[PDB]
Amino acid sequence: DDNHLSIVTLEERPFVIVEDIDPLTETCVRNTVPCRKFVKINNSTNEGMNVKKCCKGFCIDILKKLSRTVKFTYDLYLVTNGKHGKKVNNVWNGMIGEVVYQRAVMAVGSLTINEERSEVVDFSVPFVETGISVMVSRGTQVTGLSDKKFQRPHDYSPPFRFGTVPNGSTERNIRNNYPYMHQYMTRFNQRGVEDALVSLKTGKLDAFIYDAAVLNYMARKDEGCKLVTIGSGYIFATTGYGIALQKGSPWKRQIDLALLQFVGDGEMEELETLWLTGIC
Amino acid sequence: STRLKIVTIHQEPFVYVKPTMSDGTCKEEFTVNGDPVKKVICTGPNDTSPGSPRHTVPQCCYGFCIDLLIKLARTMNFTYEVHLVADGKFGTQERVSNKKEWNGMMGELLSGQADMIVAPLTINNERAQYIEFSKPFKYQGLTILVKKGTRITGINDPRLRNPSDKFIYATVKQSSVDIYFRRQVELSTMYRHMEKHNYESAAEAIQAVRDNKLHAFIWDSAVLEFEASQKCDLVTTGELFFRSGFGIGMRKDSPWKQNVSLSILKSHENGFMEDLDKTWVRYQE
Ligand SMILES: N[C@@H](CCC(=O)O)C(=O)O
């Protein structure tokens, strides 16, 4: 009861991967765990149904280890009110919002630790290193986020075409730090990572700016090893993914010690080899 | 209220320690950007040899961690006084007797000799059982320092994993690296080799690699990469075999701990931390 926790996640391969359940036997198998998704009946009603799906991936394996070590059970669900988390008219949506508004005891996923989120939720120790990286076709001459081609894009003719996936930690950082860059970039907003890689590969974008851990993975998997992150995977604004918990959560202490134990015992390295390797 | 007692440790480029001038002040110097180097007076033992008295003298302290302290104190509006850890160590928990005790900066923080550790202090499970760490102010890991020309592939090299007295390697006593090798049973062959050779300080180990008295030094990459960048007779080898971060250390009931972590996050996000890296860590090659 008090040991059985509502937990929220969000698909973002390879950290969280969602699969359809076998119509028979309506059971999740192999390395997967049950995860439900609220799906609307139509757009003229608030009626919806939870759909039973199956979840796996690097962060799901972390959750499994935490459940075993810290001794809790859980009911995992996928967020439908936004994505990772954005404050809109002073109200948090996404995984952060689910925790703030007490619909979830914790959020487990590719959830970036930053200052403004830490004002409304508690974060565990970082368990995956991340930050902001820049993906380009191999050889592209950009030094980093502070390259003038990004900071003063109209000082070049034609200007560099670059964008991010809006409404997450990367856009929030660029909006605050580089106002001119930010208002230029929004015309190149990408709906998601997969769209952005297509845009790069077909020459509609010159650079994609995004979460470092996801971008470095996508570079390792790129067909032909043509797309790279700059600086051999350099990271601006270094941070990590953290488990988000409600402020003052009684679970934070044991989650922190468990994650630190996993790192110190080498258990994290095997998860990295299992989920995050690629040819390039 | 009261000024905070800050404990730190000599560890270039995070903390440099130099004598005061004759008048008891710290010489005015300027960074590689031309800006003044911020220095603080830090007291610490005049004799650092083992088993010796630790009567103290004022000294000058500066570096990445001292710049970070100054920023934290300005942000959260506390005053402070800095001293160097009396026993020269970062901190491990050792059996005494069935008691255990913490040494190093860890022991000073838990005993009240310090109120905050500001140093390249590795966040790990063992220490977090007893103190509060901030979110990391630096992400790094472990690597291996050797003399230029020495070829070892990394942590899985047979000269490490099947050791003999023909190839000596070591780390710093009573450090997080000591803890790491003592903890993992799969590393016990290496741990037993290193226990015969571990050094009292990183500086002494690095000097011993230069003098060909130590063939490999296993230590923090943030430190070893800096050393290699300045001393071209030294190189790192094998790339990071473990990843870990440095955090500010406080007692679990410190009133400052929430805002210390928020300030660290803010500094990563607005480029302050990267400016410190440009000033102190990467600028040579
Ligand atoms: N991990 C990011 C999402 C991707 C990004 O914006 O870089 C977040 O938690 O907001």
Author numbering:
A (entry chain B): 5 to 284
B (entry chain A): 3 to 98, 101 to 289
Sentences from the paper on this structure:
N-Methyl-D-aspartate receptors (NMDARs) belong to the ionotropic glutamate receptor (iGluR) family and are ligand-gated ion channels that mediate the majority of excitatory synaptic transmission in the central nervous system. Hence, GluN1/GluN2 NMDAR activation requires binding of both Gly and l-glutamate, whereas GluN1/GluN3 NMDAR activation requires only Gly. Each receptor subunit has a modular build with an amino-terminal domain (ATD), a ligand-binding domain (LBD), a transmembrane domain (TMD), and a carboxyl-terminal domain (CTD).
We therefore attempted to use GluN2A-4m LBD as a structural mimic of GluN2D LBD and a tool to capture antagonist binding by GluN2D. GluN2A-4m and GluN2D LBDs had nearly identical overall fold with a minor difference in the Loop1 region. More importantly, residues around the l-glutamate binding site are in similar orientations to those of GluN2D (RMSD 0.115 Å over 7 residues/53 atoms). The GluN2A-4m showed drastically increased l-glutamate potency (EC50 = 0.61 ± 0.07 µM) compared with GluN2A (EC50 = 5.91 ± 0.77 µM) although not to the equal level of GluN2D (EC50 = 0.17 ± 0.01 µM). Nevertheless, the GluN2A-4m mutant mostly but not fully recaptures GluN2D-like functional properties including high l-glutamate potency as well as selectivity of UBP791 and UBP1700 over GluN2A/2B.
